[PDB]
Nucleic acid binder design. Structure first.
Ligand SMILES: [Mg+2]
Ligand SMILES: [Mg+2]
Ligand SMILES: [Mg+2]
Ligand SMILES: [Mg+2]
Ligand SMILES: [Mg+2]
Ligand SMILES: [Mg+2]
Ligand SMILES: [Mg+2]
Ligand SMILES: [Mg+2]
Ligand SMILES: [Mg+2]
Lengths: 51, 65, 152, 107, 118, 49
RNA sequence: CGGGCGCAGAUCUUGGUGGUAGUAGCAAAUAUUCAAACGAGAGCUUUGAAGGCCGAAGUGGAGAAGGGUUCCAUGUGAAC
C-alpha cells in the first residue's frame, strides 16, 4: 500500500488519502486509490486517458 | 418477459419475501425495464410494485378459549 | 445428393432430404410406409390426423410390444400408434418438397410420393446409471429421411 | 345467429364421480370445458378466472355439486386462427339451484 | 484552427434559427448535423474537441431503451432529450466536457448513442 | 473454501485462465484443425485437487 | 534368397454391429388449477389469482471443511 500510494504521487502528481488493495480471482492485484479532496478524480481520469 | 431480477430486487428493497412482492400484470413491459434498485424504488412509489399484507392469523379463538 | 431410386423423368419430379433427424428410426419408418403413393394433400391430412390421434399408424415391422387400437382396422392390421414426433418431421419435409415443386413449376395438387425411405443415422451417445455402480449406454436413434415426388 | 349467450347448470356431482380426491377439482374444469364444447359447438373454450375460484372454493376434493354457468360464444376478431369463434365461460352466483332452467340472456 | 472554425459556424446556425420561423412552437427543425472539417488523412466527420482519434459526435436511437445505472450518465442523457431529440450533436455543446465524456461511455455501450467513428 | 492460501489461490487463478475457450481466430488460422480446446474442464465432472 | 508368411474356435485381444427392442423402464417424501405476457413453438418459463405442502430439531436465514467461478447481468437454444 505504501509503494502504490507513492507511485501514483509520482506518475500523476496527485495526493492519495488511502489505498485498498485486492487480488482479483485471476491473480492480478487491484488497488482503490482515494484521492485527496483537493484533487478531483474526474479531472485526473480525463488527463491520464481513462475516459 | 421473465421477471426474476425485479422480483428479487423488490424483495430486498421492500424488506419482504418474494411471496409479498406484487408486480402489476398490466405493466409487465414497464417493470421489465427496471434493472436497478433505484428504478424499483421509483416503481414502488408509483404503485406498480406493492408489498402485499401479511396473511391474517387472528388470535380470536386462542384468546376466547 | 446421391439419392436411391433416381426418378424416371426428372422433368416432372421434386426431391427432398433430411440428415441426422432426431426422430426414432423405428417410429418414423412405420409412418413413412403409411404415406407412400398418397398425394401431398392426402398425406398432409393423414399426418395431421396422426398428431390429433384420429387415424393411427400401423406398425407392420417394428411391432413388438405395441398395443392394438380401433383405428388399425382401416389398414387391415391389428396394431398401430400415433407417432406425433414422426408425423412432424415428415410434415416439414412435405412442406419443403412442395416448395421444391412450386420453384420448379410442377402441378402441386397432383404430386404423388413415389419413393420414401428412412435410413439409420450415427447414434448419439449418452449414459444411464444402473445398480452396483454400473453405467449402461443411453443411445439415441436418429435417422436419414429422403423422398422423391412425381406427378400422375 | 352465431353470437349467442345462454345460462346452463352443470351437474358436476355426476361428472366427477369416482375421481380420486386430488383430481376432482382439476377434472371438474376438464368437464366444464367438455360441457362447453358439447353445448356451444365451438372449440377453444376460455374459462373465466372467477369460475376457477368457484370450482376451487372448497378445496380440491370437495367440489360443489351443481354450478350455475353462462356460456357466451364470441368471435376472435384478432389473430385469425383455425377456430373462428370461441366460447367464454363465466360464473353466475345463485342462491339456490331448484327450478333453474336453461334460459337465454340478451345483451 | 479547426476548433475555432467549427464553433464559429455552429453559433451562426443557432443564431440563424433564433427568430426566423419560430411562430409555431411544435415545429421540428434545427441542427441536422454539426459542422465537420476534414484533411488529407482524415476521411469525414471530424469535429475537434476543446481539449484537442476519438469520435466527438453521437446520435440517440429512440428504438432502443435502457436504464442507466450511473448517476452522471442519466444527467448527460437527459440534456440530449431536452435539446435535440434523435439529432446528431457534439460534445462541445455541454461546456463541461470533462464530465460530458464520462456520461458517454455507458450510453454508447447500451445501444443508446450510435457514433460515427472516423 | 473462503479461507485460501496465496499459493492455492494462485493455483486456482491459472486453472481458471486455462479453462477459457479457444479464440475464434485460431480456428480460421489453423483451418479448423484445432476447433475446440481438448483440456476444457467442468467444475462438476473434473476436480483439480 | 530372407521371414514377425495362411485362422472359425483359445469364457482369445481391439474396434464395430445385431436379435431381445419402441421392450424393461422414466412409480420414495399429499397438488395442482384458470387467465395473460414473451415466443416459430408452452402441462413445464414469467406475472396475477385460487387452492396446498415444509410448520421454527423447516423444504427458513447464515457459516466450518470441501468445491473453485459454479457468484452477477446480457445473449443462444447445437450438445448436456
Ligand atoms: Mg456409486
Ligand atoms: Mg462431485
Ligand atoms: Mg505369426
Ligand atoms: Mg476371426
Ligand atoms: Mg415419484
Ligand atoms: Mg422434517
Ligand atoms: Mg467468465
Ligand atoms: Mg446464476
Ligand atoms: Mg438471459
Amino acid at each position: 500500500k505504501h509503494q502504490i500510494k507513492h507511485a501514483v504521487k509520482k506518475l500523476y502528481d496527485i495526493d492519495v488519502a488511502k489505498v485498498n488493495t485486492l487480488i482479483r480471482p485471476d491473480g492480478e492485484k487491484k488497488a482503490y486509490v482515494r484521492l485527496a479532496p483537493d484533487y478531483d478524480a474526474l479531472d485526473v481520469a480525463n488527463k491520464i486517458g481513462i475516459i | 418477459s421473465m421477471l426474476r431480477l425485479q422480483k428479487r430486487l423488490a424483495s430486498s428493497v421492500l424488506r419482504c419475501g418474494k411471496k409479498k412482492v406484487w408486480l402489476d400484470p398490466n405493466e409487465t413491459n414497464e417493470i421489465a425495464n427496471a434493472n436497478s434498485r433505484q428504478q424499483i424504488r421509483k416503481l414502488v412509489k408509483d404503485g406498480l410494485i406493492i408489498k402485499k399484507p401479511v396473511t391474517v392469523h387472528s388470535r380470536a379463538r386462542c384468546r376466547k378459549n | 445428393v446421391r439419392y436411391s431410386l433416381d426418378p424416371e423423368n426428372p422433368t416432372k419430379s421434386c426431391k427432398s432430404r433430411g440428415s441426422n433427424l432426431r426422430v426414432h428410426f423405428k417410429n418414423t419408418r412405420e409412418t413413412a410406409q403409411a404415406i407412400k403413393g398418397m398425394h401431398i394433400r392426402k398425406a398432409n391430412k393423414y399426418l395431421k390426423d396422426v398428431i390429433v390421434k384420429h387415424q393411427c399408424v400401423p406398425f407392420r415391422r417394428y411391432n413388438g410390444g405395441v398395443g392394438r387400437c380401433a383405428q388399425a382396422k382401416q389398414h387391415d392390421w391389428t396394431q398401430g400408434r400415433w407417432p406425433k414426433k414422426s408425423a412432424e418431421f415428415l410434415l416439414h419435409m412435405l412442406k419443403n418438397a412442395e416448395s421444391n415443386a412450386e420453384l420448379k413449376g410442377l402441378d402441386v395438387d397432383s404430386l404423388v410420393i413415389e419413393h420414401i425411405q428412412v435410413n439409420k443415422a450415427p447414434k448419439m451417445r449418452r449414459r444411464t446409471y444402473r445398480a452396483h455402480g454400473r453405467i449402461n449406454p443411453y443411445m439415441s436413434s436418429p435417422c436419414h429421411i429422403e423422398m422423391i415426388l412425381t406427378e400422375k | 345467429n352465431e353470437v349467442v349467450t345462454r345460462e346452463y347448470t352443470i351437474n358436476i356431482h355426476k361428472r366427477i364421480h369416482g375421481i380420486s380426491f386430488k383430481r376432482r377439482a382439476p377434472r371438474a374444469l376438464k368437464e366444464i370445458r367438455k360441457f362447453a364444447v358439447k353445448e356451444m359447438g365451438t372449440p377453444d373454450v376460455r374459462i373465466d378466472t372467477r369460475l376457477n375460484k368457484a370450482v376451487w372454493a372448497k378445496g380440491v376434493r370437495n367440489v360443489p355439486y351443481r354450478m350455475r354457468v353462462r356460456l357466451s360464444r364470441k368471435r376472435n376478431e384478432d389473430e385469425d386462427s383455425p377456430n373462428k369463434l370461441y366460447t367464454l365461460v363465466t360464473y353466475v352466483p345463485v342462491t339456490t339451484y331448484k327450478g333453474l332452467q336453461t334460459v337465454n340472456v340478451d345483451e | 484552427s479547426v476548433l475555432s472554425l467549427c464553433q464559429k459556424g455552429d453559433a451562426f446556425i443557432m443564431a440563424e434559427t433564433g427568430k426566423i420561423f419560430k411562430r409555431e412552437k411544435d415545429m421540428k427543425k434545427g441542427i441536422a448535423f454539426p459542422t465537420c472539417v476534414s484533411v488529407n488523412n482524415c476521411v469525414c466527420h471530424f469535429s475537434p474537441l476543446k481539449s484537442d482519434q476519438r469520435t466527438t459526435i453521437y446520435k440517440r436511437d429512440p428504438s432502443k431503451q435502457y436504464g442507466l445505472k450511473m448517476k452522471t450518465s442519466r444527467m448527460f442523457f437527459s440534456e440530449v432529450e431536452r435539446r435535440f431529440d434523435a439529432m446528431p450533436f457534439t460534445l462541445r455543446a455541454f461546456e463541461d466536457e470533462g464530465k460530458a465524456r464520462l456520461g458517454v461511455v455507458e450510453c454508447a455501450k447500451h445501444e443508446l448513442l450510435q457514433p460515427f467513428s472516423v | 473454501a473462503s479461507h485460501k492460501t496465496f499459493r492455492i489461490k494462485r493455483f486456482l487463478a491459472k486453472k481458471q485462465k486455462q479453462n477459457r475457450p479457444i479464440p475464434q481466430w485460431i480456428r480460421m488460422k489453423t483451418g479448423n484443425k484445432i476447433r475446440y480446446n481438448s483440456k476444457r474442464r467442468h467444475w462438476r465432472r473434473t476436480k483439480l485437487g
